[PDB]
């Protein structure tokens, strides 16, 4: 999309990730599984909830009876009343249709941005320790157990702790 | 010694909800909400917790003048609005003009 | 009938917090704005891509 991640360099979504909108997939000796990034997902839920409530709650009306009744010699004001009713209809129909179109595009872009930013955060943490193998995936140059995975998903990855082990494996494999 | 894989991705589900965007029509999304109310209860209810005045077979002229076909109608001390039926025709039984009739209907509406 | 509503329509009352309705342009009460639209659906989730092509 606008940020190139959803339906972009990350081609498809995950049906096996049920606890959030954005997240991770890992695999090591101990197995594999899916986990949502709770921080980014909760921000998106807060933003989208606010976006929905704003579109609805900013419409506050007063008590009003639209209808009017006119006799056979009041045709001009009857048509004037019809013009007012039709004019509001056209304004509200046009604005409502376009607001939905424009906000849907921005919402899909917003989700695309979040997935893009999540990938970039991980890439900035891992640096040389992992290889970008495409499709939003990193393949480590050092074994990364469940505890190591939790550090990445929590943003507490210790690059120097594995930097030398990754360096040796990176330098051999590239020789 | 070289290791494992971590991947970043996003949610998917069995949703068939479709939304329109400015750039593309009929986009399937994992969650959506509807801004347009299109369902009604099919009844004439009480506005402001107050029942309407239902004239039945009479119009406002027949009701307010005391047409013999509306004498059965109950006299309520208040109403939120007035309901007539399209077939309601029992009005001024003696032919004539009801002066400022539409204005009177406005004053008696609530 | 014996029901309560804040928005009344000649073909029946509507109970809603949505800003728009397409029931009937002639309403009494605190009502949504009448529109000609048949569908006003707002995306909240992502584009749904459960499967990809065989590669």
């Amino acid at each position, epitope marked *: 999309g606008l940020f190139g991640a959803i339906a972009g360099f990350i081609e498809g979504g995950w049906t*096996g990730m049920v606890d959030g909108w954005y997240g991770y*997939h890992h695999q090591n000796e101990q197995g594999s599984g899916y986990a949502a990034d709770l921080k980014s997902t909760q921000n998106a839920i807060d933003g989208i909830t606010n976006k929905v409530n704003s579109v609805i709650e900013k419409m506050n009306t007063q008590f009003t009876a639209v209808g009017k009744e006119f006799n056979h010699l009041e045709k001009r004001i009857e048509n004037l009343n019809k013009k007012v009713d039709d004019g509001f209809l056209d304004i509200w129909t046009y604005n409502a249709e376009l607001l939905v179109l424009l906000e849907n595009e921005r919402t899909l872009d917003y989700h695309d941005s979040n997935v893009k930013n999540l990938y970039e955060k991980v890439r900035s943490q891992l640096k040389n320790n992992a290889k970008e*193998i495409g499709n939003g*995936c990193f393949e480590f140059y050092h074994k990364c157990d469940n505890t190591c995975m939790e550090s990445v998903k929590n943003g507490t990855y210790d690059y120097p702790k594995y930097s030398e082990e990754a360096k040796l494996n990176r330098e051999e494999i590239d020789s | 010694d070289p290791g494992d*894989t971590l*991947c970043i991705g996003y949610h998917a589900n069995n949703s068939t909800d479709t939304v329109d965007t400015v750039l593309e029509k009929n986009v399937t999304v994992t969650h959506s909400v509807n801004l347009l109310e299109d369902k009604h209860n099919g009844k004439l209810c009480k506005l402001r917790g107050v029942a309407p005045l239902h004239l039945g077979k009479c119009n406002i002229a027949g009701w307010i003048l005391g047409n013999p076909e509306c004498e059965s109608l109950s006299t309520a001390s208040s109403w939120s609005y007035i309901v007539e039926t399209p077939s309601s025709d029992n009005g001024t039984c003696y032919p004539g003009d009801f002066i400022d009739y539409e204005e009177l209907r406005e004053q008696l509406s609530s | 009938h014996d029901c309560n509503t804040t928005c009344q329509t000649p073909k029946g009352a509507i109970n809603t917090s949505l800003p728009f309705q397409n029931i009937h342009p002639i309403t009494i009460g605190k009502c949504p704005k009448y529109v000609k639209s048949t569908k006003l659906r707002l995306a909240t989730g992502l584009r749904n891509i459960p*499967s990809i092509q065989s590669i």
Partner: antibody
Amino acid sequence: EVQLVESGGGLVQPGGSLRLSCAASGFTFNTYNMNWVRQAPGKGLEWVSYISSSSLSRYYADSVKGRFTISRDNAKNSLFLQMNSLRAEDTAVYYCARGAQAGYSSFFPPTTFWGQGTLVTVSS
Amino acid sequence: EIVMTQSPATLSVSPGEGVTLSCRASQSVSSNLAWYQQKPGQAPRLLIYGASTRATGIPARFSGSGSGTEFTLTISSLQSEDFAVYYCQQYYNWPPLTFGGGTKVEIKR
């Protein structure tokens, strides 16, 4: 068409060594993850080993860890399985299987296409 | 590991009717389940993946559904080339990649 032909199976005494190989054709071998699956005579299917496209990730079943080594030569479209310290229970048909592309794991099952197999017999 | 259970191991049915094979999971595998068909002397062949998606070339009489722990593989009209062994498989949590015992579908006479 996707083709996987494996070879190198035969007879080996217990404690001996054997090197299975698999020839891949009809797809971009250097982008796919690969697997070995074995089937003992009259028994079900047992996954043996996994290797990634880059060869960085290699996984093994508990019953072969330390004895089997999986490898891959992407330039020669070849998959290998080194078997050492072979026991009698290792007698089986060893299948070469193709998984998902690098980065698309768990979008397609890790054994999407299978080769015919090669028979390995471990006895004295 | 995640253990796959395929009970019963043998199903005897006539030729031309509906069969349903079962597979359950020691814990949820979401939709990362696949079905395979093996004939004696031949390699396994993929039929279903994603627990419902059918593989290229697989006839429409094969279908599967399920999520979490319980899954089924249904063949609507059993032809003669469909009498074989069928294994399920999970790829939600692996390694180890676990298959399941397999179910033999046999001609009833």
